Amino acid sequence: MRIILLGALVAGKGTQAQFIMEKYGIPQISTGDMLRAAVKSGSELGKQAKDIMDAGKLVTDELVIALVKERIAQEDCRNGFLLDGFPRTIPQADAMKEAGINVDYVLEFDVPDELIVDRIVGRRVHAPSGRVYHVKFNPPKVEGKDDVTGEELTTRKDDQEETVRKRLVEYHQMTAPLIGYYSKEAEAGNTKYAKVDGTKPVAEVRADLEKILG
Numbered sequence: 093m094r095i096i097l098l099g100a101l102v103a104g105k106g107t108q109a110q111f112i113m114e115k116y117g118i119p120q121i122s123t124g125d126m127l128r129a130a131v132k133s134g135s136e137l138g139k140q141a142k143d144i145m146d147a148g149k150l151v152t153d154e155l156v157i158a159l160v161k162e163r164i165a166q167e168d169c170r171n172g173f174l175l176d177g178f179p180r181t182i183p184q185a186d187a188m189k190e191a192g193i194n195v196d197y198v199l200e201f202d203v204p205d206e207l208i209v210d211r212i213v214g215r216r217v218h219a220p221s222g223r224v225y226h227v228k229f230n231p232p233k234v235e236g237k238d239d240v241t242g243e244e245l246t247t248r249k250d251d252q253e254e255t256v257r258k259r260l261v262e263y264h265q266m267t268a269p270l271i272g273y274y275s276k277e278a279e280a281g282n283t284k285y286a287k288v289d290g291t292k293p294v295a296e297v298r299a300d301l302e303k304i305l306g
């Protein structure tokens with residue numbers, strides 16, 4: 093099955109990408125996690141991306157479409173995938189359309205703008221695994237420690253408050269047009285569109301999503 097998770101910053105996309113990944117058995121394709129992984133392995137892409145990432149600027153289209161075509165192309169995206177963080181600009185969305193990749197579901201996670209800087213700045217990451225926690229809203233069972241490996245959680249440099257603010261502008265300009273995009277397509281017959289309330293309990297939203305997919 094193929095699904096795009098679209099949404100505002102911090103709305104909870106990635107926290108759900110996990111669930112959809114097991115339940116419906118498909119690769120989670122996180123451009124965030126992959127650029128961050130390229131960075132912590134000193135791969136060539138990891139030299140381009142880090143300063144941009146860090147800066148709140150979006151990485152280059154020409155580059156991220158390249159990353160993501162390589163990945164869909166691997167034998168596990170064979171029966172579907174869920175894109176988490178691709179597309180982030182109408183450029184990325186048209187390139188996927190031009191390539192002939194039509195997806196089944198587009199799910200929009202909404203959160204009211206007041207929540208966005210709180211969502212991001214209290215967010216701790218168990219770096220190796222990409223396991224995402226919120227200090228206040230979805231905490232580890234042992235503070236500071238990750239629930240599975242016992243290893244300390246960290247904070248991203250782009251989850252630093254004034255970078256969160258630079259991201260929100262870039263978002264509004266860049267990525268906000270894709271809701272319109274995917275709604276015209278769902279109108280054209282091309283996908284299904286649903287919107288989910290990113291403020292409910294991680295629990296409830298999980299349910300809201302089963303009730304959509306199956």
Ligand SMILES: Nc1ncnc2c1ncn2[C@@H]1O[C@H](COP(=O)(O)OP(=O)(O)OP(=O)(O)OP(=O)(O)OP(=O)(O)OC[C@H]2O[C@@H](n3cnc4c(N)ncnc43)[C@H](O)[C@@H]2O)[C@@H](O)[C@H]1O
Binds near residue numbers: 106127212290
């Ligand atoms: N395609 C692309 N093109 C170019 N550059 C690209 C790109 N893709 C990536 N990049 C780049 O790399 C950088 C980062 O991109 P990326 O890494 O993809 O973005 P992100 O920082 O993970 O932010 P999102 O807004 O997508 O968060 P989310 O909705 O998944 O919510 P989350 O689960 O984290 O949740 C957030 C927090 O709140 C939590 N939470 C979730 N649900 C609830 C709830 N209901 N109640 C309370 N807390 C909750 C979480 O536990 C956590 O604490 C960019 O700056 C850009 O440079």
